[PDB]
Scaffold this motif. Structure first.
Motif, PDB file in Angstrom:
ATOM      1  N   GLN A 276      34.182  39.266  40.265  1.00  0.00           N
ATOM      2  CA  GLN A 276      34.361  37.822  40.268  1.00  0.00           C
ATOM      3  C   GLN A 276      35.330  37.403  39.172  1.00  0.00           C
ATOM      4  O   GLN A 276      36.092  36.444  39.340  1.00  0.00           O
ATOM      5  N   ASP A 277      35.335  38.136  38.054  1.00  0.00           N
ATOM      6  CA  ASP A 277      36.251  37.845  36.955  1.00  0.00           C
ATOM      7  C   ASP A 277      37.701  37.911  37.420  1.00  0.00           C
ATOM      8  O   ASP A 277      38.493  36.989  37.177  1.00  0.00           O
ATOM      9  N   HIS A 278      38.052  39.002  38.107  1.00  0.00           N
ATOM     10  CA  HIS A 278      39.417  39.196  38.584  1.00  0.00           C
ATOM     11  C   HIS A 278      39.907  37.985  39.367  1.00  0.00           C
ATOM     12  O   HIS A 278      41.047  37.533  39.190  1.00  0.00           O
TER      13      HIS A 278
ATOM     14  N   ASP B 210      39.164  34.889  39.044  1.00  0.00           N
ATOM     15  CA  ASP B 210      39.543  33.808  38.136  1.00  0.00           C
ATOM     16  C   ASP B 210      40.981  33.956  37.660  1.00  0.00           C
ATOM     17  O   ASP B 210      41.745  32.980  37.656  1.00  0.00           O
ATOM     18  N   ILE B 211      41.363  35.169  37.247  1.00  0.00           N
ATOM     19  CA  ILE B 211      42.650  35.361  36.584  1.00  0.00           C
ATOM     20  C   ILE B 211      43.819  35.083  37.527  1.00  0.00           C
ATOM     21  O   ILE B 211      44.876  34.601  37.095  1.00  0.00           O
TER      22      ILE B 211
ATOM     23  N   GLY C 158      44.041  32.763  39.623  1.00  0.00           N
ATOM     24  CA  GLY C 158      44.083  31.338  39.875  1.00  0.00           C
ATOM     25  C   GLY C 158      45.455  30.688  39.905  1.00  0.00           C
ATOM     26  O   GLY C 158      45.810  30.009  40.873  1.00  0.00           O
TER      27      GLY C 158
END
Ligand SMILES: CC(C)(C)[C@H](NC(=O)C(F)(F)F)C(=O)N1C[C@H]2[C@@H]([C@H]1C(=O)N[C@H](C=N)C[C@@H]1CCNC1=O)C2(C)C
Ligand SMILES: CC(C)(C)[C@H](NC(=O)C(F)(F)F)C(=O)N1C[C@H]2[C@@H]([C@H]1C(=O)N[C@H](C=N)C[C@@H]1CCNC1=O)C2(C)C
Lengths: 295, 290
Positions: B234-236, B238-239, B241
């Motif tokens: 899920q972090d990936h 975000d980046i 975006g």
């Protein structure tokens, strides 16, 4: 890997040049700043610039040159083919040992991409047989230069001027003569056909053999003419006797005759890689020269 | 779109040659300390008590630096020298994460030779090109006049990839600085970087791989983990975006394209002139360059 030269010797030469509303990069060597002459163009001049007329109307103080936080006083100027030469007050104390060289298709060099006189990134490039380079350049990159460094001497071989419609790039040597038939004019232009640089592919195959992979080799040889008849069907650059001589040393080191390696390349072109790689690459690399592999 | 390295000048002014006995490699000269791989002294505690300052010959170009002290920090040797480096840039020591990229200044005999762009792989190797005297070559990023040093080179694994430490001497990966059988673990493709590179492709007008579909994390990861693609956290998402908001392709829209590229292949087609999916551009790399 493909490698660029360490860029520091060139970084210390990059300056900002502004004329009117136009800002690009210049190369500050001794007491001369070299930059593309279209810095003296406005929006209205790009289609059909008359450079001698545009330049005669300029005076020294029309050119704002900035080396970091320092303004340099321009004390004269002259145009040499497609480059403007600004004489300045002060010799660059960071001037490296240098020369200007004009390169031939297949030659590689490093590019220091700059914006507003400040270095942004460095990458390796080759001059293609249609006299373009596959660069990475945005607005304001003009005057970024290409170079080699052999034994602390910087050989400047390219200054950036323009982007063609296929996304490739055109420019001059440091005497301001364009590579290829292009003009520093915003008129309809296009690169000719970009052939694969055969002599470079062959050097890279020899590099693969030296590093121990021989899977692509075969038992055949070929004549020079038969090789060229096949290779041109894949848009590969015809191989000349000079290219054969050039590969001589690598052929001596590996024990594989040049026309033997040519037969291997013919088979690679016919078969593809079959999911394999050669030097970490799943495509045939053609921006690595015979001189690069030995170094 | 090229692989681009940082301009290397700020680092070139820090490279020196370090010799101990018959062994010569590279050192990083910042202020009055030279940092280099501790294996220049070749049990390291016992080898170093037996060494004295005069055992170390430091050469900065044509000038010899006098060592006036030495100590070890993990796998890096720190040689205190008589003179501070006048060319010391603003700098910091940072440890990078797998998938992050950095520039390498390959050096031999203390003299810079080439610069290229690398990524820390998920098996904590890097695919560099280093030869016999390259140890002590460093990796780095620059952000607005500050050099972040993140890698120093120690060794080559049998598969041809490379292992090293951060500048505090902590190895990346399950490797030790001694000559014994070691091997890289199973590598993996860096998914968020491939996605970044597809965004760079659409920015450049290469749009054939886009399709009407979107996917889900678990749907994507399920297909990814069979193709050895690093699970898309899920972090990936975000980046990516800014790329996703910029182009109009939501990450899971692009993941649908990436998912189908893993099945059908590419059909001789190319994306940015490559027949393989490139995974050594980070999202920030693409924003920087584009
Ligand atoms: C891109 C384009 C439509 C604009 C035009 N191209 C053609 O006119 C051609 F298609 F004919 F080549 C073109 O490049 N220029 C038009 C004008 C100069 C040049 C120019 O803007 N140079 C830039 C210098 N800072 C670098 C460019 C910017 C984008 N990426 C680059 O590399 C000159 C030929 C005098
Ligand atoms: C290549 C090899 C057989 C030698 C060995 N490898 C393994 O023992 C491993 F496989 F376990 F890693 C290995 O690298 N070393 C042996 C010895 C140091 C290191 C070493 O020589 N480093 C060189 C530094 N100047 C850079 C190398 C040179 C070739 N290409 C490189 O990058 C140390 C672990 C202490």
């Amino acid at each position: 890997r493909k490698m660029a030269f360490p860029s520091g010797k060139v970084e210390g030469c990059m300056v900002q040049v502004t004329c009117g509303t136009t800002t690009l990069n210049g190369l500050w060597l001794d007491d001369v700043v070299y930059c593309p002459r279209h810095v003296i163009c406005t929006s209205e001049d790009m289609l059909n610039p008359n450079y001698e007329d545009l330049l005669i109307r300029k005076s020294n103080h029309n050119f704002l040159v900035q080396a970091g936080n320092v303004q340099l006083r321009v004390i004269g100027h002259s145009m040499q083919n497609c480059v403007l030469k600004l004489k300045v007050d002060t010799a660059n104390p960071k001037t490296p040992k240098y020369k200007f060289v004009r390169i031939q298709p297949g030659q590689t060099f490093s590019v220091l991409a700059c914006y507003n006189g400040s270095p942004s990134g460095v990458y390796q490039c080759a001059m293609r047989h249609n006299f373009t380079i596959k660069g990475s350049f945005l607005n304001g990159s003009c005057g970024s230069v290409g170079f080699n460094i052999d034994y602390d001497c910087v050989s400047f071989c390219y200054m950036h001027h323009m982007e063609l419609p296929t996304g490739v790039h055109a420019g001059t040597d440091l005497e301001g003569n364009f590579y290829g038939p292009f003009v520093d004019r915003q008129t309809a232009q296009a690169a000719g056909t970009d052939t694969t640089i055969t002599v470079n592919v062959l050097a890279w195959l020899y590099a693969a053999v030296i590093n121990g992979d021989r899977w692509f080799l075969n038992r055949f040889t070929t004549t020079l003419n038969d090789f060229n008849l096949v290779a041109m069907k894949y848009n590969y650059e015809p191989l000349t006797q000079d290219h054969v001589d050039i590969l001589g040393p690598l052929s001596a080191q590996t024990g594989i005759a040049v026309l033997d390696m040519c037969a291997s390349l013919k088979e690679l072109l016919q078969n593809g890689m079959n999911g394999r790689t050669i030097l970490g690459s799943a495509l045939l690399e053609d921006e690595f020269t015979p001189f690069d592999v030995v170094r």
